[PDB]
Design a protein around this ligand. Sequence first.
Ligand SMILES: CCCCCCCCCCCCO[C@@H]1O[C@H](CO)[C@@H](O[C@H]2O[C@H](CO)[C@@H](O)[C@H](O)[C@H]2O)[C@H](O)[C@H]1O
Ligand SMILES: CCCCCCCCCCCCO[C@@H]1O[C@H](CO)[C@@H](O[C@H]2O[C@H](CO)[C@@H](O)[C@H](O)[C@H]2O)[C@H](O)[C@H]1O
Ligand SMILES: CCCCCCCCCCCCO[C@@H]1O[C@H](CO)[C@@H](O[C@H]2O[C@H](CO)[C@@H](O)[C@H](O)[C@H]2O)[C@H](O)[C@H]1O
Ligand SMILES: CCCCCCCCCCCCO[C@@H]1O[C@H](CO)[C@@H](O[C@H]2O[C@H](CO)[C@@H](O)[C@H](O)[C@H]2O)[C@H](O)[C@H]1O
Ligand SMILES: CCCCCCCCCCCCO[C@@H]1O[C@H](CO)[C@@H](O[C@H]2O[C@H](CO)[C@@H](O)[C@H](O)[C@H]2O)[C@H](O)[C@H]1O
Ligand SMILES: CCCCCCCCCCCCO[C@@H]1O[C@H](CO)[C@@H](O[C@H]2O[C@H](CO)[C@@H](O)[C@H](O)[C@H]2O)[C@H](O)[C@H]1O
Ligand SMILES: N=C(N)NC(=N)NCCc1ccc(I)c(Cl)c1
Lengths: 98, 55, 95, 63, 459, 347, 140, 112
Amino acid sequence: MSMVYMNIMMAFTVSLVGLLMYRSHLMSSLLCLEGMMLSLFVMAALTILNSHFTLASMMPIILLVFAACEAALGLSLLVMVSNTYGTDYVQNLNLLQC
Amino acid sequence: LLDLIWLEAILPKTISLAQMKASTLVTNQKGLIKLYFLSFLITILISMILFNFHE
Amino acid sequence: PFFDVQKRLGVDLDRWMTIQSAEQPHKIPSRCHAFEKEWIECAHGIGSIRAEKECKIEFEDFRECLLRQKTMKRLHAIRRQREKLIKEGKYTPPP
Amino acid sequence: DGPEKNYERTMAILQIEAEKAELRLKELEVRRLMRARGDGPWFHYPTIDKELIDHSPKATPDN
Amino acid sequence: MLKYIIPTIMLMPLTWLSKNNMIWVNSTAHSLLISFTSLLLMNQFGDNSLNFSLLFFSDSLSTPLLILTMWLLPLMLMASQHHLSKENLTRKKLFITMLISLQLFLIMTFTAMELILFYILFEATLVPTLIIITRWGNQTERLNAGLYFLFYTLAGSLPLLVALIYIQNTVGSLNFLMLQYWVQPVHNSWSNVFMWLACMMAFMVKMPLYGLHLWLPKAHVEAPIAGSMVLAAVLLKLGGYGMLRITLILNPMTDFMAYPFIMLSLWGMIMTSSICLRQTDLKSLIAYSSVSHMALVIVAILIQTPWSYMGATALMIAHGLTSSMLFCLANSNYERIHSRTMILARGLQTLLPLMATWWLLASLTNLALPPTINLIGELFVVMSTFSWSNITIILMGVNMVITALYSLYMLIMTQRGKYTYHINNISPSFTRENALMSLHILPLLLLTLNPKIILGPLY
Amino acid sequence: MNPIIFIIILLTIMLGTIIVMISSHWLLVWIGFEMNMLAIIPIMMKNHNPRATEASTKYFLTQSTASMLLMMAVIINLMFSGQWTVMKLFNPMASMLMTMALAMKLGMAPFHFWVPEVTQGIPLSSGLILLTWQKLAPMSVLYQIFPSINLNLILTLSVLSILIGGWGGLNQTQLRKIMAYSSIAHMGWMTAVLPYNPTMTLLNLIIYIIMTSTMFTMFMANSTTTTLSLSHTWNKTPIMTVLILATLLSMGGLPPLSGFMPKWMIIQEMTKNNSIILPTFMAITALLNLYFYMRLTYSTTLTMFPSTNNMKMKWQFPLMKKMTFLPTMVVLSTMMLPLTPMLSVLE
Amino acid sequence: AKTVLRQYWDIPEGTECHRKTYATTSIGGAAGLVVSAYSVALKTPTSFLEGVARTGRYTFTAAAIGAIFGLTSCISAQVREKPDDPLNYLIGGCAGGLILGARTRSYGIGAAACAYMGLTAALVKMGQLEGWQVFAEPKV
Amino acid sequence: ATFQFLPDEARSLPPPKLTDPRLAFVGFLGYCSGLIDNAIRRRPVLLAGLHRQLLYITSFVFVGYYLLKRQDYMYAVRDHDMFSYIKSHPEDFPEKDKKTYGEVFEEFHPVR
Ligand SMILES: CCCCCCCCCCCCO[C@@H]1O[C@H](CO)[C@@H](O[C@H]2O[C@H](CO)[C@@H](O)[C@H](O)[C@H]2O)[C@H](O)[C@H]1O
Ligand SMILES: CCCCCCCCCCCCO[C@@H]1O[C@H](CO)[C@@H](O[C@H]2O[C@H](CO)[C@@H](O)[C@H](O)[C@H]2O)[C@H](O)[C@H]1O
Ligand SMILES: CCCCCCCCCCCCO[C@@H]1O[C@H](CO)[C@@H](O[C@H]2O[C@H](CO)[C@@H](O)[C@H](O)[C@H]2O)[C@H](O)[C@H]1O
Ligand SMILES: CCCCCCCCCCCCO[C@@H]1O[C@H](CO)[C@@H](O[C@H]2O[C@H](CO)[C@@H](O)[C@H](O)[C@H]2O)[C@H](O)[C@H]1O
Ligand SMILES: CCCCCCCCCCCCO[C@@H]1O[C@H](CO)[C@@H](O[C@H]2O[C@H](CO)[C@@H](O)[C@H](O)[C@H]2O)[C@H](O)[C@H]1O
Ligand SMILES: CCCCCCCCCCCCO[C@@H]1O[C@H](CO)[C@@H](O[C@H]2O[C@H](CO)[C@@H](O)[C@H](O)[C@H]2O)[C@H](O)[C@H]1O
Ligand SMILES: N=C(N)NC(=N)NCCc1ccc(I)c(Cl)c1
């Protein structure tokens, strides 16, 4: 494939590994989730623009809109977690262990 | 020797023991998001490198 | 679709954007319009098991238009040869 | 029941069961061919409908 | 079979719409009437079986098993109504409903034409039986007995389901009449070895085969009396009936696949007979006695001769009445002393003369005194195994000696000697108990006058 | 939650699922999953406590990750075929990514860790939705893309789920965790037969939903979430103990009950394809499920556990919970085997 | 796993013992590595060195079983002059069970492992002989 | 057709009888649901709310009838497709040459 696709897919893989390899902050993991969205938006836009798929030109916008709404829900969960424990550390979310 | 011991031991008693040990392995989890998502990374990696599910 | 409600009601909810050879604003064609049209017409109604074999020619051409893998490889071949000759003085490009 | 009734009732039962058994063997053979060749009503997986294609003249000629 | 299935079903509304104090009278009276009509299945022909419809058929093998099944329901009701007296009404009617449902599943199991229909009803019997054991047994060990009973059965039965479904794919039918004509020989391959095992192991566990029998002494010692009666009398014979049918489609592979199971059975019958000599629980002794008797049936079915198949049929019917009678005899003592320990109450002949006579007659049938059908069945198996190999007479003869010793040891320990001094609540035998024992022994001995009706199709 | 808002949120959970089921465009399928996940979170959070917040967060992270992987599969599919139609995918790497994403959404092993934890942390009514309605959309996509799924991958997921579900349930006293591990085991049967006959996948899904709804509804009726709390039912509602017994035996696949029918049919389809080891292994492994179903019958119906004195006060009041459709569902959950040939309506 | 399994099942039984033992050691080692990966991921080691030690202990244990099964099963077939015999695999499977009874030091585990790994190995040989399919291709 | 419960071509088949045994069983299931409804709400099981018990039977029968119609139609379609395919491809379904048992050799396996 084209050379640009090498790096866009690499960016998605890098953010996916970042997402699956948590540290402590929940916000850091939410940023990786947005990173995957941004790489998906670029890969979709490049494919659609280069192929001149005219009606598909709106699809990246719909992706952006829906994923931003997803991120707003994710942020709201983060603040509720932070209100409970005083931080957004994932290690605090282990009650359902038992 | 046979009825109360060995015929019990070689089938129902050993089969039950193995299941109980397996259950503890499966369910003794820390409830940590970090550990679960780490095992997802291993699963995806093994799925491609070892088993070629991506082909 | 799992439940083909669209065809039952004759209403087009998302079919309009499924393929690039469908109707587009101001009749703007996709780059691979003719290749997608050919492949779709070859494989229409015969099922995907049959189409995977009987329409392989149209699909390979359509895939070549989509990603141009064979074209880029050919261009890479001619360019690489040209560098050698420039590196050996047996070729001077025209104006 | 007299023997004649039981005997001929048995034949009626055997005829139905043998007819079902043959059809069960035929169905497995038909399914095998239909799945391998894709030329029957079963295992007919969808392909894009060709009525979605727009054939009107385009903004540019080469398509 | 609808003339039996439907009236059996009607016993359920009968029990639930009865006056509170007439549930035992009504259910007992009408189950006896159903048993009476079961004799109409004796219309058997020398060549053809009695083929009612596409679902159900009856031949000389299933007929005696059906009549035993329908005979046992009223006997079970009589046996149960005393220890259930303090139970509340709704829970009594539930108990009777489980017994009726077991009879319904059993008569359909023994007459199912199609092997997969047989499998489903064969498996449905687990549910009422398991419920009866674990809900109405007396001791803590009933919960474990239910689990052993459940998972021993399903361990073998699930492979049987796969084998049967595989056979229908290959042959096109599981109808038993069809299989009689479309059967093909089984060739030697590892595939067929495991097909053979999947087809037989579920039935071996139910017999039970020696080595897979541990569930049985648990289930009896924990089951209530009615659970013990149907478990011993009928449910074991599901396995024997299963093999007698399925062996049709396993030849000639049975020629050598039988060897490990004949060895387990021939040696097992001596081991389990010897075990009876040292048992301390009377119910556990009777349970181990069943294992030894069913070892003969397994051998008889596996060697596949006309004489062995006739002996196997007679043995299954005879053991059904004898073993169920012995459990009823042991239960009658239990209702007085509330313990199953054999050595606890002794010299009972001094205190209960007529009951001691039932003990003597049950013992003599258990050790196969000629010409009881117990002896007829065992002798036919002895005759056929001798032709299989002359050396089997050594094992079969030794087992006859041991069977007499433990049959009469049980009689001598509990009935003879001196009575226990401190056991002073041995009230006289009730009319109900005496009638229960006679309804076992009288048909058992009457069958000696006309054995052909319990000798099966090979007669 | 305002009752009108609750209704609208519930209708949006359903609409997201319906969009997935009627869509012919991958983008609209993705939207249906996003809409569905947006509306489910509030019903997981509705009882406002740290356990519910942890459950919703773990759910959000799992589902959002799976939906990104699904979008990636769709886009790879677009590059290698230039179209969006919901059907077989035209790239093996796209097929793997979509299969893994749907496995994460379904909570199949080894992506199962979230199911027991999320189910434990949310109310019974929310757990009922999570383990029944929420399986519809991902299964309806597998139903359509199966011609291109990797056989080894899907059967490995099925086998692991049956094993993990069976083993995981052995160690549970919480009713919500038992149902979760039971769900993981049952998803394994649904997907094991998918490559061979998707109709049996639908049959197993439908019967699974009916039986699961019956259990949750009976748990809600008595407000029971633990094994010991359930063991008091005999002293309050004896009829319920019997219905639980029948449903549990059916869920254990015992004939002649309804839950035997899916296992029966799946074994048949697999053997027709000369798959003998896998069905046999599956059927034996499912005995682990039967074991911890039976344990519950022992402590609920077949024995009488100790009671408390305050239980007498409960004798003076009647059940007031809705128990909607419970009489219908319990009959279907147990008494449908004689109508097995009716499965052809699912063709 | 495909290629390693292809090397092993290409070599005729009872011959080329060193190549068979290598193939099973690689198979056993890979299984050990997979188990270590999940074990370390889900049960976090107290330290970096404990985790490395656990990986070696598991991987070496799994490679030890793989090596002994391949050698013993190939030695048996060679010595007995029976290539297509499930008994050879039954022997090698039990040998692996003994090793697992040694690494864990538990006569009970070794005895149970030998019976079950022994039976499993024999069934694998039978399946290869008769074409048993574990993941059967759809056909009807 | 397409997303049609009973396509128009199903009307060429005989309808299920109203005395179909399967429809009787479906009605019986509805009756059992009516009784369980009484039981779980601690009403007199057989007598309470006969109006409610009547609708339980009617609802089951009503839905059961249409389900039975679709069931029989699907099986009729399966047979229709199968026979048409056997005709379309006579080469794959030849008439086997049948021999009598006098000509066919079967090995004999004595039981001795
Ligand atoms: C041969 C084919 C059939 C084989 C079937 C084998 C599968 C298992 C069957 C029995 C399962 C019963 O399930 C469980 O079994 C074990 C013993 O086995 C019982 O446990 C029993 O033995 C263990 C160990 O000696 C004791 O700790 C326990 O006190 C005792 O009750 C459990 O109380 C029972 O809940
Ligand atoms: C042929 C294949 C058949 C497959 C059948 C699968 C059946 C699985 C049955 C359940 C297995 C787990 O069942 C469980 O077994 C263990 C031991 O055996 C029992 O555990 C009991 O005995 C063990 C052994 O001494 C003790 O360590 C333990 O303290 C005690 O509680 C559990 O009480 C029982 O619940
Ligand atoms: C929970 C809320 C649920 C609300 C559900 C509401 C459903 C609304 C369906 C809208 C689509 C109606 O049906 C569809 O509409 C659009 C515009 O009307 C039509 O589309 C029309 O505009 C553009 C112009 O090029 C093209 O799509 C097409 O050339 C033309 O026909 C479709 O031909 C028709 O099939
Ligand atoms: C439109 C479809 C409706 C189908 C309904 C068909 C059956 C209708 C039955 C209505 C009569 C029910 O009868 C009601 O329940 C039982 C059974 O008779 C009676 O009381 C019962 O007490 C005991 C059992 O407990 C028994 O003696 C006997 O079963 C009966 O006398 C009640 O005193 C009566 O009020
Ligand atoms: C209680 C446990 C009971 C256990 C019972 C065990 C019974 C064992 C039966 C052994 C017979 C199995 O079936 C036997 O398998 C061998 C393979 O090894 C098959 O052998 C087949 O493949 C080999 C290739 O190696 C060929 O040389 C041979 O021509 C061919 O027959 C035979 O066709 C079959 O005769
Ligand atoms: C307690 C029991 C637990 C379950 C045990 C289940 C055992 C199942 C049997 C193992 C599966 C069969 O094993 C598999 O069979 C096929 C036969 O087509 C073999 O097929 C092989 O044949 C040729 C030549 O023979 C080889 O060159 C090739 O490598 C391979 O295709 C596989 O190499 C083998 O891996
Ligand atoms: N995909 C499969 N393996 N099975 C499958 N659906 N085969 C198609 C055969 C079939 C079977 C029953 C009916 I009713 C109908 Cl109409 C068609």
